[model samples]
Target: STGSATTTPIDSLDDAYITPVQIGTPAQTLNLDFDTGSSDLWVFSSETTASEVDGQTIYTPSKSTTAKLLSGATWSISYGDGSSSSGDVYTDTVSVGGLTVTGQAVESAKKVSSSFTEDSTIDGLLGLAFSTLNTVSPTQQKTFFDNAKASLDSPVFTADLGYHAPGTYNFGFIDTTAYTGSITYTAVSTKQGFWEWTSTGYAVGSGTFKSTSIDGIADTGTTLLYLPATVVSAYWAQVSGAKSSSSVGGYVFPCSATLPSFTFGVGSARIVIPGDYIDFGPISTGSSSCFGGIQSSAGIGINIFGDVALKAAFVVFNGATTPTLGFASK
Candidate 1:
């Protein structure tokens, strides 16, 4: 699946929380979604009514050899993609890939909505994204990395997303064979997780950004790269015959031309967004045509780099495993 001609659906972090952990005396194994986007690990319980269960892959707590709910807490999760689920907080002993970790945090949602309530093949999500995204603000502010970090042998955890294939999501250590080169780390200050970067400027085709000063963040939760309106317009100015269509917002020149190459500075990392990304067109709504990845964002708190920039680079989320995030060549 990690090759050309493969269009893997990068499932935007969904509701289900999954963590592969060991359970019981001999230790039964399971893979879970430890979502940073949310805070709790919820599964189906014996009391769940069949009608209420549709999209979720519920873990029957009664059926589970070991399970426990938190003492005083209600839990829920809301995704950036606009999906959500609600339940109660609990604690349970779990194991993944034959590795047993004790007293893990879990949430059992009595009520779920959207994809979570309907999809039958998933277990639950593992919150590896951030603490702010969690539904239960005060009760459960930190993610699995926050709680489990103390117990893990190694401080580095790696998520090997298989795309179409079943990925071997491992913690404590990264299997080097899955990638092409050694993993690298980006300098991060306290309280930063989302891929943050400073831009150098934008350039298309053979043109270069020598003194251009542009900077922003890149995130997968967002579908496009939202640049400053002035910068967006300025970059288009370089492209020959490029014109801005206010109706489309950004530059919408004829795709047939030799589209220019745009680059942004990220500390020492210079990233380029090729013309293919500029070929904009239709979404679900027919009225709106596709636009380039670089668009306009008026007043967002922080810039989200989004998947467009991320997909071009190999990324690793260290979570609580390491003090910093891990990244490198794919």
Candidate 2:
């Protein structure tokens, strides 16, 4: 239900936060960047020829009996700076301190872009962002947190990211001891209040629409769409290879897997979330599996239409006494 993992900054400028993730059966230890910018769990591996490898640790699928090839799967991702990598995919047991997820997507690089071959400290990135950004083909997967969510007593993870100092990532439940005051919410309070509303109904892809009142918060600041467990599960059922992994804490599938768009009702208007937007991203760099942007809100007790849903359409927040939320998508 919980885990506490230490994260350290690697460079003098603290370019990225690095943490230890163990993979395979016997467990090959590799230091991975716990990244929030990208979604994918890629690593240096035997697939990467010796000339391209520096001193970074590599995960060898053949060495672990628990490792299994994800047949017909491949992944490729390019960085904004022009650096890129592509490789085959595999599923194996993955552990991060007190947490572990079996059948996790582990991208093994066949070829890495130029600058990457030169750097030796980063093995790969453990992306924490929404899965819509994953680069796997045919099928995308979930993030480690998504896969691990079900097992957690509470479906939440907190990051104590530090500047130049050491920090930690806590999962499952909040460590109240970390903070001085109780977390406060200010949205429509006399001084603060929330953008809360009730969604009339929703549809998966272009599937049949279900009519019901789904009370939720229109939180544009959030990054993912959180709804009821049954509603969220219905969406993934249409995609092949999508899996719920507790260690990862959400839904995941092959990067190239065919994805369906999403829709939610706001009064008389219906907003459609493009299939691509719902794709989220890869769990790690070069990972064959990608994560999903829409997740179950059961953990939080209230549905939330975050940026994942907000980005697909135009919305207006009516703060009038009879407050109402508006949506528009052609």
Candidate 3:
């Protein structure tokens, strides 16, 4: 009734949390980027052009007896990062950790964006967003979590994202030991096909918590924390020599600068992201300027609580008929 899987990070940037997913009859294992923000279980596959395929493992349907083509079904998805993928669709048995779902829609890639092609670490993306976000034409498909929800011991999944290390994505139950104190629950809306919610406020290092309503999504797919420009400005202002430089892009400061902890409220609880985690990484090799993990969401339109913010807390994505999100400090 419960299943757990370790999400491995390929790089120090915590670019993506990839977990091995078993698909098809022979259990073709592919490392998929587990994305809670998108809902299209697309994969690199035999249908993809040879040139479009880089170093990724392609799922060959012909090798699996249980694979069935879904006639006229197709899907295409593009992300905020300008990368996209699209292709034909198939239905097959898909398993994550121990949870299994039959007839799961497996979108096979016929074309992929250069960004996706260049990244050899991920074979595809396993979207955990609601089925309404599914792009398959003629008939939409349910996400792996959606299909397995009813059978789960508890129709919920938790993400324990770690900084510069492997983390866990547990299905059906919450790991009590993963967090400190009680879980802070907040209402969520999936109308936009995302786990959308309004956060109470935020604080910069020892600064007072500014009580302002901020709307955002809990996305494991994205790499950085994107908030309003004001918030980003406030954060960088605390760092000496920080500035918005189009030359380097976003906010960057001297690598020697000290950063303060960032705290945000969920309900009455305040979760703090340590200063080091917000330090992201150096802008370039041998460069003295380093990029800040927190950036402006103005261009993207909606704020995003991405990996930078997620790594500091244990998150629960409750999939009950009326869904809610829970946040707990680690």
Candidate 4:
């Protein structure tokens, strides 16, 4: 299918709700999370009871101009977060920004909870991360980008929007205006987003610490940049006496001392994470520990490079064409 050109803003409030897609020969509207941590686009469907569908948005075939259901392409997916959903196969016209990348993939689950069902504003998610995250599919073989890349013009896709509030969802076709072009590209870590990618590590202060090693995945779906234990510890050690305090579920520190800085060498392009960006949560009443902005999630293999890190550079997700991810600057 040729691309349909249109302009739209993508938002986080949209959550997992994405544009619609075709179900078998007929089209059906479904919602899916555009997860960078993992690759899978699913929706809620007929097999689901109204109770299970309580919190989730279910597709009403009559509501759409074109919608259809796959006879037996049923599936159930479970995530590390412990949330799970099941649904039958279906598809429809999926649109994002102003462009409609047809024959796109989608999912419809049978049982969806209210929390998962909350209004995400947008109808579905368009996974904009790496291809390795693609879902193992029997019904839909291609990742959203795998299908979109063929029709995309720039041979690139960029996610330039952020999810910050209510009634807000956004999507966009990368505009040249968003890039500086003069900026250099960061070579993808041959190992993916998890590793000690930096050639030179840092100490929070004057004191020297063991080699700084951090493990995390550069994730678009996650809202913040998370780090492993060693990196977080090494980060605070430099803060002199930055103490860690409670912030929601994680830790934050207070550091009156000069904050530390770290550099990410993406091949030839080197970007520095300033001190201001390092503080994780709020400081405690009277403690030397400062809240490290980079939280620790042990036993987890993925460390997400979220908005805080992404905003500093021009990022693109070219799900439409050659399906390459480009990071330049504007």
Ten residues in sequence with the least summed lDDT for candidate 4: 161-170
TM-score (all chains, Cα) for each model: 0.65, 0.56, 0.98, 0.67
Best by TM-score: 3
Q: Where is model 1 more than 4 Å wrong at Cα?
A: 1-53, 95-99, 113-123, 130-133, 151-153, 159-170, 174-184, 190-206, 210-264, 271-282, 285-300, 318-322
For model 2 the local lDDT of residue 37 reads 40
Q: Cα miss at 246, model 1 (Å)?
A: 10
What lDDT does candidate 2 reach at residue 69? 94
Residue-by-residue lDDT tens digits, candidate 3, 1-330: 888999998788787889999999899999999999999999999999889898999899999999999999999999988899999999999999898889999999999999988999999999998899999987989999998998899999999989989999999999999999999999999889999999999999999999999999999999889999999999999998999988877988789988899999898899999988888678888888888899999889899999999889999999998999999998
The residue-by-residue lDDT of candidate 2 on 1-330, one tens digit each, is 678888776654344567889999898999887654456788889998788888889999999999999998899988533678889889999988778899998889988876778768778778654456667778997778767877876665655544445666667666665544233221221111345667778998779899988877655324578999999999999898898878778999898898998888766557778787676577877888888888888757667776567555434333233444445442
Candidate 3 Cα lDDT to native: 0.92
Top of the candidates by lDDT: 3
Ranking by TM-score: 3, 4, 1, 2
Residue 158 CA displacement from its true place in model 2, Å: 1.4
How does model 1 fare in lDDT? 0.52
lDDT of 4 at 172: 38
